[PDB]
Design a protein around this ligand. Structure first.
Ligand code: HEC
Length: 104
């Protein structure tokens, strides 16, 4: 995926509710640093729904591609109110940005 295009998607559609940087602040949604390879609902110091806490999957490319297409479908009961990203290539670019940004 294209990381720079993914960054612009992140800023436009996600940054209102999320930061990605290490030690970044929780906002409406959790800081996302360290997301990849982690269970759902584990960002330290964020108060999640039971749904997000209990989903019981591990975040990676496959699971983020599905979630970000339709969040409430993948995690019914979620308090992330976001319609989703329809285009596969947009999700892929965003996920590539996230894979870099949330690890560095
Ligand atoms: C834009 C496309 C994005 C991306 C990539 C993410 N979000 Fe959100 N998000 C929000 C809230 C309140 C939560 C917690 C939900 C709950 O507890 O039920 C989330 C959660 C996530 C996750 C899961 C994190 C985990 O640790 O399991 C992920 C991967 C995620 N978000 C990515 C709130 C918002 C928004 C508020 C209006 C918006 C906009 C977005 N999120 C957008 C995005």
């Amino acid at each position: 995926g294209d990381v720079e295009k993914g960054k612009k998607i992140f800023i436009m559609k996600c940054s209102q509710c999320h930061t990605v940087e290490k030690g970044g602040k929780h906002k409406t949604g959790p800081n996302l640093h360290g997301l990849f390879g982690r269970k759902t609902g584990q960002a330290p110091g964020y108060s999640y729904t039971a749904a997000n806490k209990n989903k019981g999957i591990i975040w990676g490319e496959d699971t983020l591609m599905e979630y970000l297409e339709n969040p409430k479908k993948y995690i019914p009961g979620t308090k992330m109110i976001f319609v989703g990203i329809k285009k596969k290539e947009e999700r892929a670019d965003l996920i590539a940005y996230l894979k870099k940004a949330t690890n560095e």
